[PDB]
Design a protein around this ligand. Structure first.
Ligand SMILES: Cc1cc2nc3c(=O)[nH]c(=O)nc-3n(C[C@H](O)[C@H](O)[C@H](O)COP(=O)(O)O)c2cc1C
Ligand SMILES: Cc1cc2nc3c(=O)[nH]c(=O)nc-3n(C[C@H](O)[C@H](O)[C@H](O)COP(=O)(O)O)c2cc1C
Ligand SMILES: [Mg+2]
Ligand SMILES: [Mg+2]
Lengths: 305, 305
């Protein structure tokens, strides 16, 4: 079905195509959903870089992840605060993906914009009290404190995405994240401040993913977990290293930590689900790597190898 | 770009293809986003009708709109309450669209599932008090009482979709909806009950659209407006008639109304934006048709002809 391309083109998420042969990656195609979501007609944006949606309040770390990914010819999934032409604000989960036809590497770039404004505002109001049956059905797979997905969402997605990865021969990578000296932060600074530090770390981790299937969840009271698909070994090592550095650059003053700032120990394990098809083995390996990452660096990512 | 089909296939909204040559319209294709959103692997659903997501609490009017649209070989946009395989609940805005290749009418059907759970729960909590800067930025284009889009969203979309319709030679149809004897409902029953009747009518109108670009907005205190694209004259007459009948079937007891139940006067006007390119003319024509619909039937849809 070739018309399927044209019918999916008329979607509710923005679809943009940008030429990579030309400098600054100008937008070469814009669907109807993009103009409806942003207010910018196609005649106004064709041949221009899509940074007009950004303003001075944009997350510098997310835009930097976009730039690095495009220079390294790698996909990325970021959540951005974009402004429409009228001046209104909408939260955009942008997925960038290269286009490679017969080794024609990165001929163009695919940008899928999804209006996630309601999700951001609702999840932010979840840590406050703010009863409703439909709200409780939503909170089943959402942690109230951080607003991220819960351990149930991780384990269910682990089964689903394992079957999907074994079909397309894609890798499955699980990152076990633990806060260092968290009991010292709760005893000295306070338990409420530890919850505020949990939110700040959660908000920092829940961005700058590599692909749309990837996500972060809160596994324990101080533990987080990230699931990623289709990453090589080098990309997994860089992604895990940069995550530990991002929490370090937050520089939340921790008196109990010998480093002076709260850090993150990361232990990740990558596996090919098509070979062994053994679930929960990756989590066990990632938890053993997290244990090794505690004493090895206490502010580092250790791969179970 | 032919790989663009495969890259868009890996989206965050579910993509399903169903064969129409076979009875009950069995699902013939399922993307990764569908299994992640619903928990149903492809091996479990291929060759089956997608009604397994529905349960006894599903909106009967929305499922009936799906059935009628598929039998009439027409697209539809409905919001449904679907259940995942694990038992959790997610709100699904499903867009169905036929596939016609070289007059190969309705060879298959395209089903795009979009998780709009957060949007439903947030907009429902908007009529309650429930401050936040980001929430106020969202409430710019949202009416607090009904939860629908506001008059600003309608007028801006009217400019955007007018340019889009003139590009693809698509029709633009505007429906002017007004509540009959609304002051009699507020005086006798009460102003609060009139607001509850506004929500019930708004919740009924904000569903069972024909295409993903269509929407409903609250134009005035008792006035609603619907924008639709690509509808013929017969489809616009049936859609406007069925909307007046849906509010009538709600049967909210109105003592001041001679019919015994509150009704809806509808005055719609369809135009081809490529010809005249005169905005606000359709709204003026639709408002004159609404005035004629008041005295002509008081519970009918009148087309400005
Ligand atoms: C196809 C494509 C679509 C894009 N769409 C958006 C967008 O919708 N919102 C946004 O904030 N950035 C978007 N960008 C990213 C910006 O255009 C820009 O490349 C990014 O901000 C990095 O550039 P800069 O660091 O020089 O500002 C898109 C990029 C590409 C390639
Ligand atoms: C391609 C396609 C995808 C569908 N996906 C869903 C869905 O995700 N959720 C849902 O409630 N109904 C979905 N449906 C509609 C149901 O499969 C079914 O056709 C509809 O409920 C009407 O059938 P019924 O009245 O006999 O139950 C889909 C239909 C088609 C053709
Ligand atoms: Mg710890
Ligand atoms: Mg009236």
């Amino acid at each position: 079905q070739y018309l399927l391309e044209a019918i999916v083109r008329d979607a509710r998420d923005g679809i943009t195509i940008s030429d990579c042969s030309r400098p600054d990656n100008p937008l070469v195609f814009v669907n109807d959903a993009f103009t409806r979501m942003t207010g910018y007609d196609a005649e106004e944006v064709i041949g221009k870089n899509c940074r007009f949606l950004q303003r001075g309040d944009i997350n510098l770390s997310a835009v930097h992840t976009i730039k690095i990914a495009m220079l390294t010819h790698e996909p990325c999934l970021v959540t951005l605060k974009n402004y429409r032409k009228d001046g209104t604000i909408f939260w955009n989960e942008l997925s960038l993906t290269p286009i490679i036809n017969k080794n024609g590497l990165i001929t163009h770039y695919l940008g899928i914009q999804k209006d996630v404004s309601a999700q951001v505002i609702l999840n932010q109001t979840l840590h406050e009290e703010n009863s409703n049956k439909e709200m409780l059905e939503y909170l089943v797979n959402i942690d109230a404190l951080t607003g991220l997905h819960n351990r149930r969402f991780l384990e269910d997605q682990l089964v689903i995405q394992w079957k999907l990865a074994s079909r397309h021969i894609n890798t499955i990578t699980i990152f076990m994240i633990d806060i260092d000296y968290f009991k010292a932060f709760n005893d000295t600074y306070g338990h409420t401040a530890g919850d505020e530090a949990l939110r700040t770390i959660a908000k920092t981790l829940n961005n700058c993913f590599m692909r749309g299937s990837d996500f972060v969840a809160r596994y324990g009271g101080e533990e987080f977990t990230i699931l990623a698909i289709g990453m090589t070994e080098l990309q997994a090592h860089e992604y895990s290293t940069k995550l530990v550095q991002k929490i370090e650059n937050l520089n939340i003053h921790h008196k109990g930590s010998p480093l002076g700032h709260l850090t993150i120990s990361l232990g990740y394990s990558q596996a090919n689900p098509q070979y062994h098809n053994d679930q929960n083995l990756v989590i066990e390996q990632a938890d053993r790597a997290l244990y090794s990452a505690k004493v090895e660096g206490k502010n580092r990512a250790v791969a179970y190898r």
